[PDB]
Every structure is written in structure tokens, then in C-alpha cells.
Amino acid sequence: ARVKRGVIARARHKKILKQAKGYYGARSRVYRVAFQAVIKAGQYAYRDRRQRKRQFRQLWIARINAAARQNGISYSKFINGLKKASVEIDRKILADIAVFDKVAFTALVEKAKAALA
Amino acid sequence: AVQQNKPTRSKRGMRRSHDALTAVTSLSVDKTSGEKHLRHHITADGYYRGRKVIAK
């Protein structure tokens, strides 16, 4: 019962080379290099699904800080004011309001300043 | 001395970017026979500047 490996070996080499589309040079042409590139790409993707949640929160905080200082208060005192006012809007929404609705964001600063004062 | 890494096809193409041939700009036209020829060269039938210079 001799088993020739040609059909299944080509199938799995194509499966790797298909995931390597768009890589430079041998990384999208030859299996040995493409296989390492695909594994490394999977490692980065796993790591960056966690980093994505840090980078976006870091971006929201920066935008909130900018919009808060336009109203005369820092991000630190603004967040502490909202918690003292029992407001539970998260940073993704606050950064969203800070860009698309200035007057609603100013109303939030007034609410935060009242809880501090 | 020899390469430590195989140069890419990209690097190979960049080196050959100066290997392109330059075609002759324009051929001259003889005033007598009207043939085309390299400037300052006699024509294929032995004319140069409107004169049969070689009878072959």
C-alpha cells in the first residue's frame, strides 16, 4: 500500500502560499519563507488584538483631553468630576461627542465642574 | 569575495536600468537618391551628399 504524497502536499503548500498574498519577494513565492511569514503574521495578529484595545483608548483619552482643555479643565479633573456626578459614559463615547457635538460636550464639562465645586 | 545573500530580482532590475539601448535619433535623407542613411555615412548604394562616390 504505497502512498504518494504529491496531491496532499501541494494542497497544503497552496494553503500557506494563499495566506501570504501581498508579501514582498520570496515571502509570497516560496513555501519555506512564506510559511515563516504566515506564522509571524499570526503571532502579530494575536498580539495586536490586545494592542488595538490599548491604542484606541489611548486615542480617546487624548481627544477628551483636548476638548476638555478647550472648556477650561484637564482630563484628570474632568474624569474625576464625572465619577463624582455618577455619570458612566465611557471614553469611546466621550471622544465621539467631543468631535461631533461640541455643545453636548460643553454640557458634560458643566456637569463635571459642578460635582467638583 | 562573493555574496553573502542572494540579490533580489528587484536589485537586478535596478542595476539594468542603465542597460537600455538608445535607438538612432533620425536618419538622414540623401538629396539625390532620397535614400535613408546614417548622418555622415554613405548610403547603401554608394551615395553621399548627392554624389555617387563608389560605383558598387
Binding site: - | 542597460d19 537600455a20 539601448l21 535607438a23 538612432v24 536618419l27 535613408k36 546614417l38
Partner: protein, 110 residues
Amino acid sequence: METIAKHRHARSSAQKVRLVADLIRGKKVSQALDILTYTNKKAAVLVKKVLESAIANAEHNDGADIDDLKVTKIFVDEGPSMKRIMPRAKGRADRILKRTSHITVVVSDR
């Protein structure tokens, strides 16, 4: 109406013929024949015979006229290589590749 002529197994490497091929890519056949006449290259003689043979095919098989033909497509593919043995110093041997090429010229009025 495209018209093709080919020279397969031309005794010249594709890299050398491609230098001549890009001189006439897109030119009118009357202008291309003058370029090939005054190109001091061996490949220029090979390409010229394929070009003028494509012109003959266009006028005899397709009834086209020479005045409107243009070199719309031209490319040189690698042909089979002939393996040869060249003796080197100290009893070592090297394998010499006598490369060939396939020359393809496509003329068309459109």
C-alpha cells in the same frame, strides 16, 4: 486584426534580445524597420526577420496594408537551454548553458 510571427529556439539569450525588443515596442512598422537596420546588435537581425515576416503574414493572410501596421505587442520568452561541459583548471568541470529564446512580434492596424 492582430497578426503574429514567432521565432522559436532562437540562438540568443532572452536578456540580450530584450534590449532590442524594447526599442520598437509601440512603433510603426516603417519606423521600426529603420531602427532595426541601424542597431549594431546580433539580436537586431533576429528581430528584424521576425518583424518583416509578421508584416508579410498581415498582408498575405489578412490582406492588411503596410501603411497602418504598428508593433502592438513584442516579447521575448526563454527557450530551452542546451547543457554543455567546459573543463576548468585542476580537473574541475563547469556546465555551460547555451540559452535560447522565443521571439514573438504582434503587428496590428488598431
